Amino acid sequence: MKEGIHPKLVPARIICGCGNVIETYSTKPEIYVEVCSKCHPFYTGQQRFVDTEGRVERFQRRYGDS
Amino acid sequence: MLMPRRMKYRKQQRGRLKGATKGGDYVAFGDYGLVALEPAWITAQQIEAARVAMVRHFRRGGKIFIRIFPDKPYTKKPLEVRMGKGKGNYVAVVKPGRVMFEVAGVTEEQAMEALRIAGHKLPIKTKIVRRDAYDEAQ
Amino acid sequence: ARLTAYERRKFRVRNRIKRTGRLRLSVFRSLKHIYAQIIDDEKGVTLVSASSLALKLKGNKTEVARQVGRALAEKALALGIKQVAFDRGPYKYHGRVKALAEGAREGGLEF
Amino acid sequence: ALASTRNGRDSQAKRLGVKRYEGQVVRAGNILVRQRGTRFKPGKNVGMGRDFTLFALVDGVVEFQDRGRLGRYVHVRPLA
Amino acid sequence: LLLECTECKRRNYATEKNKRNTPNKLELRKYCPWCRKHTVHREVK
Amino acid sequence: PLDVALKRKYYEEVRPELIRRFGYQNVWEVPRLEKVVINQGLGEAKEDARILEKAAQELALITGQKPAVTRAKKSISNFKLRKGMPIGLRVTLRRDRMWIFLEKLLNVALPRIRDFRGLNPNSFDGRGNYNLGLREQLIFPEITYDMVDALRGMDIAVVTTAETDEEARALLELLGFPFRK
RNA sequence: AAUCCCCCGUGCCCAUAGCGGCGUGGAACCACCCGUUCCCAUUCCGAACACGGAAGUGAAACGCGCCAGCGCCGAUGGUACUGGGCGGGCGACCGCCUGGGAGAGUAGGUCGGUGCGGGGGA
RNA sequence: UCGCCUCCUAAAAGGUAACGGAGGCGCCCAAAGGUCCCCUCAGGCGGGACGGAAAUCCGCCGGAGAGCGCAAGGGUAGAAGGGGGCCUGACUGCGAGGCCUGCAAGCCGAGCAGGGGCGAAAGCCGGGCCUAGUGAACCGGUGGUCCCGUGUGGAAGGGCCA
RNA sequence: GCUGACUGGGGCCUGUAGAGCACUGAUAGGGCUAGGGGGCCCACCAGCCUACCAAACCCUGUCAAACUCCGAAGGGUCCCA
RNA sequence: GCCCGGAUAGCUCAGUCGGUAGAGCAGGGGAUUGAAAAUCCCCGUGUCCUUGGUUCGAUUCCGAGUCCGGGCACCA
RNA sequence: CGCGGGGUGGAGCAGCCCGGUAGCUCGUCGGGCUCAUAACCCGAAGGUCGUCGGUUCAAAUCCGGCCCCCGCAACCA
RNA sequence: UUCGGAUUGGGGUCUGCAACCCGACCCCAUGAAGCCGGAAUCGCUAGUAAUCGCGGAUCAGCCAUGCCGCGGUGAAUACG
Ligand SMILES: [Mg+2]
Ligand SMILES: [Mg+2]
Ligand SMILES: [Mg+2]
Ligand SMILES: [Mg+2]
Ligand SMILES: [Mg+2]
Ligand SMILES: [Mg+2]
Ligand SMILES: [Mg+2]
Ligand SMILES: [Mg+2]
Ligand SMILES: [Mg+2]
Numbered sequence A: 001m002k003e004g005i006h007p008k009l010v011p012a013r014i015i016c017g018c019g020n021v022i023e024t025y026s027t028k029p030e031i032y033v034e035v036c037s038k039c040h041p042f043y044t045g046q047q048r049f050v051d052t053e054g055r056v057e058r059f060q061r062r063y064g065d066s
Numbered sequence B: 001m002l003m004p005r006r007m008k009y010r011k012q013q014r015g016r017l018k019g020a021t022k023g024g025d026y027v028a029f030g031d032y033g034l035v036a037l038e039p040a041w042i043t044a045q046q047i048e049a050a051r052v053a054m055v056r057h058f059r060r061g062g063k064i065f066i067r068i069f070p071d072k073p074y075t076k077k078p079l080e081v082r083m084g085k086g087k088g089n090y091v092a093v094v095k096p097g098r099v100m101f102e103v104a105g106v107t108e109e110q111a112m113e114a115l116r117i118a119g120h121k122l123p124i125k126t127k128i129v130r131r132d133a134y135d136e137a138q
Numbered sequence C: 001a002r003l004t005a006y007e008r009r010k011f012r013v014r015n016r017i018k019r020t021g022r023l024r025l026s027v028f029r030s031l032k033h034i035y036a037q038i039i040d041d042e043k044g045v046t047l048v049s050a051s052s053l054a055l056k057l058k059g060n061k062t063e064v065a066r067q068v069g070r071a072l073a074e075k076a077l078a079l080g081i082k083q084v085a086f087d088r089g090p091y092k093y094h095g096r097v098k099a100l101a102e103g104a105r106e107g108g109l110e111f
Numbered sequence D: 001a002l003a004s005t006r007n008g009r010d011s012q013a014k015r016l017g018v019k020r021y022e023g024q025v026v027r028a029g030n031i032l033v034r035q036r037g038t039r040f041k042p043g044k045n046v047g048m049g050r051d052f053t054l055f056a057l058v059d060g061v062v063e064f065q066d067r068g069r070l071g072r073y074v075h076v077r078p079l080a
Numbered sequence E: 001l002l003l004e005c006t007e008c009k010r011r012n013y014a015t016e017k018n019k020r021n022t023p024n025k026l027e028l029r030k031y032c033p034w035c036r037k038h039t040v041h042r043e044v045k
Numbered sequence F: 001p002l003d004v005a006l007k008r009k010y011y012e013e014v015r016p017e018l019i020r021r022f023g024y025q026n027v028w029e030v031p032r033l034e035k036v037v038i039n040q041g042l043g044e045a046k047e048d049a050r051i052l053e054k055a056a057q058e059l060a061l062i063t064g065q066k067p068a069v070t071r072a073k074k075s076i077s078n079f080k081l082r083k084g085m086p087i088g089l090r091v092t093l094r095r096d097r098m099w100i101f102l103e104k105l106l107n108v109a110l111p112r113i114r115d116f117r118g119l120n121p122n123s124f125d126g127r128g129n130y131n132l133g134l135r136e137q138l139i140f141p142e143i144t145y146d147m148v149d150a151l152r153g154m155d156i157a158v159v160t161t162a163e164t165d166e167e168a169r170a171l172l173e174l175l176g177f178p179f180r181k
Numbered sequence G: 001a002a003u004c005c006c007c008c009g010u011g012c013c014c015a016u017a018g019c020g021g022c023g024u025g026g027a028a029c030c031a032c033c034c035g036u037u038c039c040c041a042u043u044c045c046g047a048a049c050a051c052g053g054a055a056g057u058g059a060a061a062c063g064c065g066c067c068a069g070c071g072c073c074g075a076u077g078g079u080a081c082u083g084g085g086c087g088g089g090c091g092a093c094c095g096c097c098u099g100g101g102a103g104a105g106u107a108g109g110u111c112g113g114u115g116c117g118g119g120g121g122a
Numbered sequence H: 001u002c003g004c005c006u007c008c009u010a011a012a013a014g015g016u017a018a019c020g021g022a023g024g025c026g027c028c029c030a031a032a033g034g035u036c037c038c039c040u041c042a043g044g045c046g047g048g049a050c051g052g053a054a055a056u057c058c059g060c061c062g063g064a065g066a067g068c069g070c071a072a073g074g075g076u077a078g079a080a081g082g083g084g085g086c087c088u089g090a091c092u093g094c095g096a097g098g099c100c101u102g103c104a105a106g107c108c109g110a111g112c113a114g115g116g117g118c119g120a121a122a123g124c125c126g127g128g129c130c131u132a133g134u135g136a137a138c139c140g141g142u143g144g145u146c147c148c149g150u151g152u153g154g155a156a157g158g159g160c161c162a
Numbered sequence I: 001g002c003u004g005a006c007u008g009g010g011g012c013c014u015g016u017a018g019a020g021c022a023c024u025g026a027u028a029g030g031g032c033u034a035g036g037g038g039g040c041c042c043a044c045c046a047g048c049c050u051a052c053c054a055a056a057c058c059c060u061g062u063c064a065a066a067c068u069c070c071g072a073a074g075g076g077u078c079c080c081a
Numbered sequence J: 001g002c003c004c005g006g007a008u009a010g011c012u013c014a015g016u017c018g019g020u021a022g023a024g025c026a027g028g029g030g031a032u033u034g035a036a037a038a039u040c041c042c043c044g045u046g047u048c049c050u051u052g053g054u055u056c057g058a059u060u061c062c063g064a065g066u067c068c069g070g071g072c073a074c075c076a
Numbered sequence K: 001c002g003c004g005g006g007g008u009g010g011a012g013c014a015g016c017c018c019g020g021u022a023g024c025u026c027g028u029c030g031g032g033c034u035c036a037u038a039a040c041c042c043g044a045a046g047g048u049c050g051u052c053g054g055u056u057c058a059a060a061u062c063c064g065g066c067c068c069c070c071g072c073a074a075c076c077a
Numbered sequence L: 001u002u003c004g005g006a007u008u009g010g011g012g013u014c015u016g017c018a019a020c021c022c023g024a025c026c027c028c029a030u031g032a033a034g035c036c037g038g039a040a041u042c043g044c045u046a047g048u049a050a051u052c053g054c055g056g057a058u059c060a061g062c063c064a065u066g067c068c069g070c071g072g073u074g075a076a077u078a079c080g
């Protein structure tokens, strides 16, 4: 890497909906990540929260009782 | 009519009719052929005249192969005299031993009688042939 | 991908040398050793050989090289050989290869 | 234009070719080949001029060499 | 645009070609004289 | 730095899984991961190359390498384009610096993408490298959202010494690449 | 010290040495390799070039083999053409003597040969 | 239509005609020049946000079909193509020897000397891959210069070099 | 004053006759396939059949002054008689 | 050649005893009317033919200049 | 056959030189004014430049072929 | 845009034999055009014009922003 012209890329800390990624090793140490998926909310480590498909599921249910 | 699309040059030198030979000559597509005995520039309009003689001869039926093609441009002057070349106005150059035409999928008396009519439309002497061992395999 | 940058660079530099028509002082250098071979083209022939490999010496591949260059001079100058041109092959004139060259004086030279 | 004649030019023959052949005695400076591309490459004792013209560099005899895919080559052999 | 090109002294020099609207500047470069050896040479006239 | 968690993760527990799966006479035959090349094409900056060096500043920030600038191969009419001009930035990272970036990409960036039901698994290029592309740059940690004057995405290319996509797939899965299966 | 064999340079023939497939080699050469402090680097990247190395591997590359699917080469025989000498046809054109003689194609060949030097075995 | 370049005609040396078949030139570039160092195309298929037949990127295949300012041809990646750093040899004084050729012209050119450029060097460098991009002499303009200077010193006016 | 035309031998040069289709083009019959002519099921990505268009590509079959993977006979020049 | 006179925001342009400047049909905003217009009322960097230079000072003074015009030149 | 000019929304003309950009009048369409139509006013649509090729990054524009248009010529015989 | 609530998604309430075509109403989500309107053109002279709500007829329910009415606040301006 040519000497001049460069971000620092110095060891860091960092945060999320989870705890830390000690890994870091980036420019601009100590950053705040809004939420990740990995660390397993939101997709990975499937939460499947709020979950859909209820549209065929419902109309066949409220229907024949009424 | 019969004629190329796309020529690279519009007009081209006459050249010789020499040394009757070279390619075609072995009856590759069909049952009987019409082979050329003499050299000639045969014209896009004599070719079509032979074709239609034959297709008219059998019931729109049979199958016809042609197998010479008019890519050589033929110029003529107007009744002027001498300045520039040109103009217009197409031929296939045909030496001895060539198979033009060559019908197939018809009866012997048919093919042979069509090819005889077809031959009358040509400027040269012709020969009707059948097909051979000699016409190989390839 | 045919005929690599190595063998273009190779050929390019070689042919230029070969035109001037001196004897060729030709340099192979591997990761481990560095060899140098003085050639007369048109007789298709090597005349004066010198390796680190055959002089069985080691450490600091550059300082090894100045040595296999001094080795060549002493060896070569002994056959009458003085003027030649430096082949340098597919190698930047630098470091190890520069060093063998600036060790190939006390004889030889203009390099 | 088209008919009357739009044609009618050509350019002077450039009189290009080999001007000395194999086993032919030459002097330094004689030119051996006149040519458009690198059609013959210069060999031993042979220069190229800016127009790809091959000349003897030394007196000698001229030998022709066909190095196959390396081209053809003209050299002058001394005993000059 | 044919080009007449001097240095400074004795004004004899040597002659050239810039047909062009660039360079438009004093248009100067290093050349040998008939007079001593290898001086400055600025364009002119 | 030579430590870098993903690098580590690759050696202890990604490599061996891989050998168990395909099984490999040689230590080399088991896939390494070489070269993540990040390429921004920007027609966006065309007549204005002033905009450009802000975007280059941005890549550096998230890459830690300053990008070089690609310039236009041939000249083409329909969208502007003198054969002179700069089209985009392209930055090659390897070796540590690729790792320290791929980590960040896996554990931060891609999570922050709106939707993201996972990376497309057909983008393997058939000889076993993989490509994807991103719409916004603010999905990265080093970017503050107030430093974006305008959105420009990029093309990430990841080169792999695996001869096939199958193997290649395995490597990146095992590294933690979220896949839409 | 000759001779052979293997490697490393390096020439020559200029594809009969090429592609593809398969197989093989790490002691020694060679390579990839370890690192990037230093010389020197990269329009970004020690990829390349460069240096200081030597833990590992012949995976890649290279080297050595073996396969004729392709690629390349290629008779003999016969024709075409033709220098020279003669005929024939209104013509377009044809033929004979004597001397030269292809191209295509068929048969077949080929997975290279070799010089100098080194390192290692004979 | 008239001079110049390219191709065919042109009969495998050169040369070769017609109001034969077809195209181009009357410029251009201070970088499109010199050198040293590096790099290698067009196309096809696969992959990649805005990117579509085509902007950029990644992978494999691709011996040249690309590029070489412009016509064609010959040539050319073992560079003549593309990038970069230094630079101005797009020098002065000559020129062995040849190509060509009715003359006059046109063309190539090693080598020596002066002072330089790039290069560790060998070396290369007297414009540009090459073949068109041009015009005898006479008359005159300008810058210089030693030369002549109509009794003599000047000057007028010339010569010579550009 | 033996060097001449011509002739013998040996080298080098060449790209015509012939022939070929590797290039540039043209080109018959068939095959397999991009794009579509659109029959229409759409009118949402669709989407199939083509006895019309059709690249490239394979098979068979040809043509060329300004095409050549090839290529004679001859010709030219030098040397020795 | 050249003498020179001609070069305006949006165009024609109009403006040299030098001390930061403009009119009409245009453009637009606004009153009028059948409307078109005319008339009436308000705003538009024209760094006014370029650079360096005299001055506090510049369309409007000194060296070159870029361009324009006629009339006169010349042309081997 | 010869030389010169042309061919562009429905009509009639610019634009072509000098490559990148299609404009003007009328007509047509929608609205207004009028009892109504015309006139008049406010809006809009409408084209690939005869054609086939080639040049270029790019063609109405530059080059070539062909097809039409108009003009001139066709003399000594 | 806490402007403006057109369009659409899902959830329901009521009438009614029955709300796909075609009901009104509630809630959650959605939030479009619209920054005072070209030529042109309407009403109004006082408790009027603006503006604000309220009732009824028809009627199961309602597409009523309509229509017939009721009051609250309450201008401007007429030279001619
Ligand atoms: Mg025949
Ligand atoms: Mg044949
Ligand atoms: Mg006839
Ligand atoms: Mg007559
Ligand atoms: Mg007959
Ligand atoms: Mg010629
Ligand atoms: Mg895939
Ligand atoms: Mg791979
Ligand atoms: Mg070959």
Ligand SMILES: [Mg+2]
Binding pocket: G026
């Ligand atoms: Mg080993």
Ligand SMILES: [Mg+2]
Binding pocket: none
């Ligand atoms: Mg081992």
Ligand SMILES: [Mg+2]
Binding pocket: G058
């Ligand atoms: Mg291997």
Ligand SMILES: [Mg+2]
Binding pocket: G074
């Ligand atoms: Mg053969």
Ligand SMILES: [Mg+2]
Binding pocket: none
């Ligand atoms: Mg034979």
Ligand SMILES: [Mg+2]
Binding pocket: none
């Ligand atoms: Mg004969």
Ligand SMILES: [Mg+2]
Binding pocket: none
């Ligand atoms: Mg005869």
Ligand SMILES: [Mg+2]
Binding pocket: none
């Ligand atoms: Mg043969």
Ligand SMILES: [Mg+2]
Binding pocket: G110, G111
């Ligand atoms: Mg082989």
Ligand SMILES: [Mg+2]
Binding pocket: none
């Ligand atoms: Mg060898």
Ligand SMILES: [Mg+2]
Binding pocket: none
């Ligand atoms: Mg040995």
Ligand SMILES: [Mg+2]
Binding pocket: none
């Ligand atoms: Mg040719």
Ligand SMILES: [Mg+2]
Binding pocket: H010
């Ligand atoms: Mg000839």
Ligand SMILES: [Mg+2]
Binding pocket: H011
């Ligand atoms: Mg001849």
Ligand SMILES: [Mg+2]
Binding pocket: none
């Ligand atoms: Mg002309």
Ligand SMILES: [Mg+2]
Binding pocket: none
């Ligand atoms: Mg340079």
